[PDB]
Amino acid sequence: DKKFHGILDQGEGVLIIFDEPPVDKTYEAALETIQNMSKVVDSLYNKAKKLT
Amino acid sequence: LLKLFTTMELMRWSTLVEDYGMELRPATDVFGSTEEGEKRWKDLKNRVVEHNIRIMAKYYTRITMKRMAQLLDLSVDESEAFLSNLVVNKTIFAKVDRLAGIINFQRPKDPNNLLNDWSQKLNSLMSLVNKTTHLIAKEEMIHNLQ
Amino acid sequence: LMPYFLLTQAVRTGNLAKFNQVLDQFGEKFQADGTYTLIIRLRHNVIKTGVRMISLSYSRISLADIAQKLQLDSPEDAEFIVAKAIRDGVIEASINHEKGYVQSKEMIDIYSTREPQLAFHQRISFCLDIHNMSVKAMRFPP
Amino acid sequence: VIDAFRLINANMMVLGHEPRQTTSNLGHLNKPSIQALIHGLNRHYYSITINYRKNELEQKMLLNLHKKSWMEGLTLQDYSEHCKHNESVVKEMLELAKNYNKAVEEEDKMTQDPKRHLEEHVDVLMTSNIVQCLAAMLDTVVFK
Amino acid sequence: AVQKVVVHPLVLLSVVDHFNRIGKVGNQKRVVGVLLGSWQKKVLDVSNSFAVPFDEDDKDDSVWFLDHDYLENMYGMFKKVNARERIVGWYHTGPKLHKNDIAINELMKRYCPNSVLVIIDVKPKDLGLPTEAYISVEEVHDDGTPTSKTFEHVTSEIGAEEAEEVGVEHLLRDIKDTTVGTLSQRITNQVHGLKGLNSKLLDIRSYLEKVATGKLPINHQIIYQLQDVFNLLPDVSLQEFVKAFYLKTNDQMVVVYLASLIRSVVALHNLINNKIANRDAEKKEGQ
Amino acid sequence: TRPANHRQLTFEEIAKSAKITVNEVELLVMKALSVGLVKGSIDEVDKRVHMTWVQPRVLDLQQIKGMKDRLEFWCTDVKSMEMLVEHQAHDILT
């Protein structure tokens, strides 16, 4: 349920707790921009392949 | 006593008690041993322990629990409890690997912070070499005149 | 492609009987297109695919377990087959015959290394080339 | 905004002869300010062209003002601020990309500022990132 | 003492003009004058300067004729013209010091307690600033060596008021570079920085060779500073640094890759528009 | 003497240095740190000491000659990479 940043290990019987680095927002914004450019390329198809 | 508690070095409680126990053997408090409300001796022991913790956190990165206990003059478990209490109080930062007893004071190292430290080292190096070249220019540019 | 669907099903199942019967049934299309040398090289890479998956879904599997799971006759035969898998580079794993188990390459978090740099470099060069070609193909008839 | 002036003689002005001879295409080439026209740029006085004798040595010594030291040239911009700026610009670029798609799609259906802003943002990102990466490599294999 | 000194373009140009004037009217090895500025903490701001008659013997290196009467007269005149400027130092246009500089600084310290000497090299260098700032401090060397009155380097900088700054920009508009980071200029800046670092290392190396062969004495402060340099050298073969560096390089290159992708898409859109326009124009012209 | 490249010092080698068993090299390094001579850290888990500073002291001519050699190498590397970069970017340098 993500109450604290840790992963168990039922072997040696350990609870490796730590701090998870924050999700890099740059890759996020890059991914949505990639999606936007993909749909822009779709628009460019609709223009060119139909007018030429 | 005040010199030791203001200097930045670990003082073993055993040695301090075999040195300055004269108190109440003189003054009016911190009795070596007396009535319960004025046997603060334990509080002084805790103060010595806390000072040692501060010094170690300042001048270590990875101190094994065995060594920490035998240096602090407390059992391994007693030292663990004291360090845990300090960590909870937020007075000290120390992450304890109890699997191997690898108490570590190294705060997590952000790549941003690591490269910033490297860049700061580079900047200091460049400034130092620039100042040195100025000073050495003056040095040679005076003496070679002779 | 339905005959090739049957062939793919047979290879994935690893059933030599199904492979042989489908081959016999659809030999006609096999001259129609031309794959026989490749279709026996198939049987080769059928056992190769078996070993590749066995190494893909495992990290420290033993030679006896490999033989049992691939129905291979002997652990020594399985050892030869895994060595040929090393030839083909389709398992990218080590092995230790002192104790008799095939250890796998210790998986590394591949972002603190030059693989992302190389991939992004290829893609950046491609994008620059597209821009150059576009701005060169820009034409004015006058 | 500097100007140089000299007076005109009333006798010549009354005689009608122009206050100042014109033998060469120089001297002119300048638009006299309407302020001076009102205050008598020609009735009472006349302007003079101003040239500057910029010697090479003086030009160099002036350049020394904002000349950047080699420390500045070879230093590394702070990495935390660099990442924060990269994120700011990338998110603004994302928004501009959304607007650019909307504009291009509506243009095509019917048959710019988003494109211009996108070009500016991409240029700044590329230049800053490449500069810092190259400086990082220069430093890391010059200082060891 | 004073920790920093900032000279002004007006001072620079006055010094250059003075040296050129003296050279034109007759060959000479140096030209000397006074520096007026203001104090704001230990950051001196030399906002003006003026020449003073001066000549010395090059052989004996102990006879010279700085004109203190001239100095005081023109200082009073400049005080009358502008108030908030007082004698803060003296300048000379000498590429090298001389055995007289200390005597002339003794003369100037009567006018100013913290008199600052400024060596201004009219000859244009290419790496550093043309002005060097020195101050005379004499004290019992804790090094236990014989103590001799000598100068000490002072941090120097070039700074201008808004007035001088607009003036210099207007003068330099022809060759002034863009006040913004363009990729080619940044690359050239890194190359120039490498040039400067190489020159500084070569100078330090030449001094070290001189000391090692013995033509010079050993400065403990210099040895200490170079020790600090070599000790401050970083280590770039460490794994916990290599991983971080690779991570940051990958991040920067993903940003670069996204940028290039957008730029290519825009270029393709422009080409599509151009093709459509060209075909429409040709069709209309034909019909 | 140890350069920054491999500046890591060990309890064992300190013991081979000034005669002390490896249970008080920790205290010796502690005293140095406190009096403010060397700076760094102590990793007794692996029994090593990391140094990143040393109170500079007057040196000898042979030491200065070795330092000169090191700076020879450094300057050679700097010049080489400068030439490399200028040659590579020759077509964009202003």
Q: Which residue of D has its CA nearest to A39?
A: D101
Q: Indicate the residue of C112, C113, C127 with minimum beta-carbon distance to E264.
A: C127
DSSP string computed for chain B: -HHHHHSSS---HHHHHHHHTTTT---SSS-SS-SGGG-THHHHHHHHHHHHHHHHHHS-SB--HHHHHHHHTS-HHHHHHHHHHHHHHTSS--B--TTTT--B------HHHHHHHHHHHHHHHHHHHHHHHHHHHHHHHHHTT-
B chain contacts of residue D78, beta-carbon cutoff 8 Å = 116, 119
Mutate to test the interface with F, among B3, B5, B7, B9 (most CBs of F within 10 A): B9
Task: Select from C9, C105, D74 the least CA-distant residue to E188.
Answer: D74
User: A14 - beta bridge partners?
Assistant: A9
The answer, for E253 touching chain C at a CB cutoff of 8 Å, is: yes
Whole-angstrom CA distances from C126 to A42, B1, C123, E260 are 20, 72, 5, 9
| CB contact at 8 A, D35 and D72 | no
CA distance A21 to chain E (A): 13
User: F54 - beta bridge partners?
Assistant: F38
The answer, for A17 touching chain D at a CB cutoff of 8 Å, is: no
Q: Solved by what technique? A: cryo-EM
DSSP string computed for chain F: ---GGG-EEEHHHHHHTTT--TTSHHHHHHHHHHHTSEEEEEETTTTEEEEEEE------HHHHHHHHHHHHHHHHHHHHHHHHHHHHTTTT--
Chain-centre distance for alpha carbon E179: 19
Residue E34: strand, helix, or coil: strand
CA distance B63 to chain F (A): 6
B chain contacts of residue F34, beta-carbon cutoff 8 Å = 7-9, 59
DSSP string computed for B37-68: GG-THHHHHHHHHHHHHHHHHHS-SB--HHHH
DSSP class of residue C60 equals S
| CB contact at 8 A, D106 and D98 | no
| CB contact at 8 A, B132 and E87 | no
Q: C–E: how many Cβ contacts below 8 A? A: 64
State the chains in contact with C (3 or more Cβ–Cβ pairs under 8 Å): E
Do the chains contact at B9 and F34, CB–CB below 8 Å? yes
Do the chains contact at D93 and A33, CB–CB below 8 Å? yes
Residue located via tokens 């104090």? E39
The answer, for B120 touching chain D at a CB cutoff of 8 Å, is: no
Do the chains contact at A37 and E276, CB–CB below 8 Å? no
Distance between the two ends of chain C, CA-based, in angstroms?
52
B residues 92-111 closer than 8 Å to D (CB): 111
DSSP string computed for chain D: ---EEEE--HHHHHH---SS---SS-S-SS---HHHHHTTTTTTEEEE-------HHHHHHHHTTTPPPHHHHH----HHHHHHHHHHHHHHHHHHHHHHHHHHHHHHHH--HHHHHHHHHHHHHHHHHHHHHHHHHHHHTT--
CA distance E249 to D137: 10
CA distance F8 to chain D (A): 17
Say what the resolution is, in angstroms: 3.4
C chain contacts of residue E274, beta-carbon cutoff 8 Å = 138-140
The answer, for F71 touching chain D at a CB cutoff of 8 Å, is: no
Q: What angle do CA A10, A16, A21 make, to 5 degrees?
A: 140
Mutate to test the interface with B, among D69, D75, D79 (most CBs of B within 10 A): D79
E chain contacts of residue B61, beta-carbon cutoff 8 Å = none
φ/ψ of B4, rounded to 5, equals -65, -40
Do the chains contact at E194 and D132, CB–CB below 8 Å? no
Task: Please give the structure tokens belonging to residue B85.
Answer: 């209490």
| CB contact at 8 A, E117 and E133 | yes
E chain contacts of residue F59, beta-carbon cutoff 8 Å = 223, 227
B chain contacts of residue E228, beta-carbon cutoff 8 Å = 128
Do the chains contact at E153 and B138, CB–CB below 8 Å? yes
φ/ψ of B44, rounded to 5, equals -65, -40
CA distance C50 to C64: 15
| CB contact at 8 A, E8 and E163 | no
E residues 110-169 closer than 8 Å to D (CB): 122, 124, 127-130, 158, 160, 165, 168
| CB contact at 8 A, E180 and D128 | no
Where chain F is discontinuous (C–N > 2.5 Å), the residues before each break are none
The answer, for A38 touching chain D at a CB cutoff of 8 Å, is: no
User: C93 - beta bridge partners?
Assistant: C104
Cβ density class B67-92: b for 16+ within 10 Å, e for less: bbbebbbbeeeebbebbeebeeeeeb
| CB contact at 8 A, E264 and C131 | yes
Q: Indicate the residue of E191, E204, E205 with minimum beta-carbon distance to F86.
A: E191
Q: B–E: how many Cβ contacts below 8 A? A: 78
Do the chains contact at F30 and B64, CB–CB below 8 Å? no
* Strand-strand pairing, F38-43 and A6-9: unpaired
The answer, for E281 touching chain A at a CB cutoff of 8 Å, is: no
φ/ψ of E174, rounded to 5, equals -65, -50
Q: Which residue of A has its CA nearest to B109?
A: A21
Sheet holding F8-10, edge to edge: F8-10, F48-54, F38-43
User: B104 - beta bridge partners?
Assistant: B62, B95
| E71 contact partners, CB below 8 Å, separation of at least 6 | E34, E52, E87, E111
Mutate to test the interface with B, among F44, F53, F64, F71 (most CBs of B within 10 A): F44
DSSP string computed for C69-116: HHT-S-HHHHHHHHHHHHHHTSS-B--BTTTTB-PBP----TTSSHHH
Looking at residue F89, its amino acid is A
Q: Which residue of A has its CA nearest to D99?
A: A36
Task: Please give the structure tokens belonging to residue E264.
Answer: 């290519």
Q: Which residue of D has its CA nearest to E123?
A: D57
Do the chains contact at D138 and F77, CB–CB below 8 Å? no
Q: Indicate the residue of E256, E278, E282 with minimum beta-carbon distance to C124.
A: E256
The answer, for A14 touching chain D at a CB cutoff of 8 Å, is: no
